[PDB]
Amino acid sequence: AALPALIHILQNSSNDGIKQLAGVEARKQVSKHWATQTSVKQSLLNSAFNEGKDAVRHANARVIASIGSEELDEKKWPELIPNLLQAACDSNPKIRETAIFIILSLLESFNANLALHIDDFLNLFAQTINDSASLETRSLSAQALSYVSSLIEEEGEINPQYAAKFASLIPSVVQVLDATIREGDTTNTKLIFNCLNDFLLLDSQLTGNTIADLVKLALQIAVNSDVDEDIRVFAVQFVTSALVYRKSKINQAKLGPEITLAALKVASEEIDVEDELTNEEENTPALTALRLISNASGELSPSQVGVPIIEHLPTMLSSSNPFERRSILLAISVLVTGSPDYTLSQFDKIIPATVTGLKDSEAVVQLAALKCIVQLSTNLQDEVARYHEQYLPLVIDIIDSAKHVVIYKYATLALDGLLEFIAHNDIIKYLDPLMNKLFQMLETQQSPKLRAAIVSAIGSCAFAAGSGFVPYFKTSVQYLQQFIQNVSQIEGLSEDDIELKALTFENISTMGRAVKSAAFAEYAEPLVNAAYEAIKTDSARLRESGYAFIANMAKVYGKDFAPFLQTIIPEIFKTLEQEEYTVNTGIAYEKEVAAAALSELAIASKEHFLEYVEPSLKVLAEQVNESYGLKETALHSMWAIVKAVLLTANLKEGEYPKGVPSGSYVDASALAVIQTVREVSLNNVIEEVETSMVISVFQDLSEMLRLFGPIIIMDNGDSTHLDQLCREALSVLKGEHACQTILDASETEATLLDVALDIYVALSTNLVGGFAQVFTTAKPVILQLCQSKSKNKRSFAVGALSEIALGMRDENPFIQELLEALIISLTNDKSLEVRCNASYGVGLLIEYSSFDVSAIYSPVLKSLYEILSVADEKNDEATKEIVDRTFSNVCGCVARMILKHQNLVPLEHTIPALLSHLPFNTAFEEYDPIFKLFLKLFQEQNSTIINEAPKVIAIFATVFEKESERIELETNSTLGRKRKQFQSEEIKQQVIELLKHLNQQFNGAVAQNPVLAQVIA
Amino acid sequence: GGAKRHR
């Protein structure tokens, strides 16, 4: 035992470094080596209160603390805690400061006997926290209180009298914070902030109602530029933590707009423009503020975060202060991730704003515009691309005249994300000049960081262009092979060197998806071997890119790729079983893509995967139980394996028998695989607190029930898993699920509602009339949700009601109750979007009704006509999609009504207004009742339609032109990327037959159309 | 997932 050797060196060494590090090692040894105990005890106490330098003082103290936890377990050294308490109230400030320090060290040991002393500590610290002599004493007291709070809560029932005491000490801890900042004590200002962060986690009885007021205080610190920056970062982090752990308290105070605008002002502060433009921390306040806005947008309603930011968009964007223009753009770009729906609806304001940024004189504003666009494209992919006509020339110019390496990167990075989602027929207009520019750039730039961005942009061209990329395919692969040499040799390659290789593998495989196997056949043998070389390499990033190549190959070659299973599945299983550890992000990414490749292979190599099912579910099941960041993906992949297995049993998507199975329509072998995954799915939603895992689970379950029917959730008349499912789903609707129980909501919470509503919409289509018994518990809640304060909640609910009605059809025994509710919405709701979704349900219910609805035709039609007339006024793509969906839904509803009871409807004014909104621009499913009505009206030789034949042909000209545009895309588009005009082949033929008769009649005006003349013959 | 990348 060299324990005493350590303390003797700690006390008597000539070098303070020695005495210090001796005590550091003495602490470690106390546990292992602790008769003359009392000789060492007294020397330690003496040196603690007398050594000149606090650093050596603290050393002895910490040894004392571990020693004291040892003896209290033997219930020895009874004098320690009483002497320490005596010394804390001694008249010598230095004696008190050292006593409090030792007490904190004791509390840090977490010894159970300290629970016997809650009152002493509360009484003692209530004094010491106000010690006017020593700011260190007050800060140590604040720190000790965090441990005393935990102690009082370990008790089954928290003692009220204690918690009242603690709740009064909180205003004192704020006072210490003021002291530490006035005196410039940054070290203790941090320490106190940690005590405030720890209060967020406490029960409400201990804290009082102080949380909002703490946030209000942290904001006032954070916005004041006189304060040291490092102190302000502390303040912004504290608010950020409050949004995470205590958002309920923030909402009560409506502190969202305060938080947002506070962080918006902090983010408008001067920054290192030169470092911004070339560097490749988040300890400057302006940057921590953006992380605040980010968290705020993800936790609170867009009314709290986004509405303020967008209210301030006009003035900051035109300010003469470049950092304000830069700020509002970056603020938006961090907003889109948490509030993408809200952001998309502000595209009328935001897109012109990013266009303004691209035109700024100051490069820092230009880089903020670009980051904003990148962020827009990542989250709202297609929508941003539509504006390519203005973006592309502005972004290309920035590349040409770029003077800084980071501008070039983000210009290239924005071009990538645009091209990636630009529409097939639009990229063709541009394909040749961009390809020449992209390759011109790839030649010129030599830094791998830039070349990697150009390579991704070039691959994005392939993605958009699909077949249209074949002229460039060979030319491109020739150039790119230079980046994919010596794959196994990773030594001496920089992080970016691997990235330039990894991306080249990934985007060459995206070229194969674009130009399918026939044009890819030239390079399959070398590339597939290279990719397999990457899998065997030792860089997670490089193995990851190999898996990307495999997963894309699976798409291109299908079953032809089965011969490779034997070599690949072994490497995939190895990758997935890796340790994930701080956490190794490179491995996490590598595991995500390997799991994707596994799913893609099973779907592709249909029969051949069967021997791999048990192992793949075994490996994937394991990761669900034990993985850190792969549970959601791993579960999704288990369902992809089921999809592969069911597809191999020639169970066709959508062709299941409706209703509850008294037995099974899947062979016993496949049903075993379903049940295995179904139990794992149910277990990860029941009492699950991560709303990510619930959304993910509910989504997989909803898709798989839609594809393969109720067997996914129940078999052999045993509804045990179906009942558990509804309990959880209904729980989410009531707002009472584990993940909810930690009135405007966050888009994330909205999404949780929708996916639960979608569990019902999927079951109703799967059970039809057998659904009614399940639907009964949810029906009042969903109906209730139709009347919510939230327009978004109303819209989701009314839409789900409509889709439930469609699944139940004429076996709906609640049609009358549903119709009354949706008519109320159709009539009285103030949201056009809600009234539009209601119109769809109303027509469906009327179509399925077998009772008498003559009473409600006149009011419903008057409401419908009004919805049309306000949408006519509004006729900003966000409004245009709602306006256009209203046109389709309203016209669909009238049509369903005329087909149901043609004689209760006056066709004279109705048919004209209907024609006036055809052809549609969206929601072409509502063409189906309109087609059926045009078929009925002509066979009756109904005059109103027969005098209106010319517009009818013009409409079918467009209908048929779009169906052939769409058929072309189906063959040209990249493999794996609702545009249907006809909901069935039968209705298509019936429309065709009518087009012939129209030709027989009316002097053949149908054939006078190139488009229909082609279809008539 | 309707995008080119798999991560």
Residue numbers in the entry:
A (entry chain A): 39 to 72, 78 to 323, 330 to 630, 657 to 817, 829 to 961, 967 to 1068, 1074 to 1113
B (entry chain C): 13 to 19
Sentences from the paper on this structure:
To investigate how Kap123 recognizes H4-NLS, we also determined the Kap123-H41–34-NLS complex co-crystal structure at 2.82 Å resolution using a H41–34 peptide for co-crystallization (1-SGRGKGGKGLGKGGAKRHRKILRDNIQGITKPAI-34). The Kap123-H41–34-NLS structure shows clear electron density for residues 13–20 of H41–34-NLS (13-GGAKRHRK-20). Notably, H41–34-NLS K16 binds to the second lysine-binding pocket of Kap123 in a similar pattern to H31–28-NLS. The same residues that participate in H3 K23 recognition (S505, S509, F512 and N556) form the binding pocket to accommodate H4 K16. Additionally, side chains of R17 and R19 from H41–34-NLS form an electrostatic interaction with E469 (repeat 11) and electrostatic/hydrophobic interactions with E593 (repeat 14) and Y664 (repeat 15) of Kap123, respectively. Conversely, we failed to observe clear H41–34-NLS electron density at the first lysine-binding pocket. Therefore, the crystal structure of the Kap123-H41–34-NLS complex indicates that Kap123 recognizes K16 of H41–34-NLS mainly through the second lysine-binding pocket of Kap123. A major structural difference between the Kap123-H31–28-NLS and Kap123-H41–34-NLS structures is the missing electron density of the first Kap123 lysine-binding pocket. This implies that Kap123 recognizes H4-NLS only through the second-lysine binding pocket. The H4-NLS K16A or K16Q mutation also reduced the affinity toward Kap123 although the effect was mild probably owing to the additional contacts generated by H4-NLS R17 and R19.
Kap123, the most abundant karyopherin in budding yeast, functions as a primary transporter for the H3:H4/Asf1 complex, whereas Kap121 acts as a secondary transporter. Kap proteins share the common structural motif of helical tandem HEAT (Huntingtin, elongation factor 3 (EF3), protein phosphatase 2A (PP2A), and the yeast kinase TOR1) repeats with a right-handed superhelical solenoid structure. Here, we report crystal structures of full-length Kluyveromyces lactis (Kl) Kap123 alone and in complex with NLS peptides of H3 and H4. We identify that there are two spatially separated lysine-binding pockets within Kap123 that specifically interact with H3- and H4-NLSs.
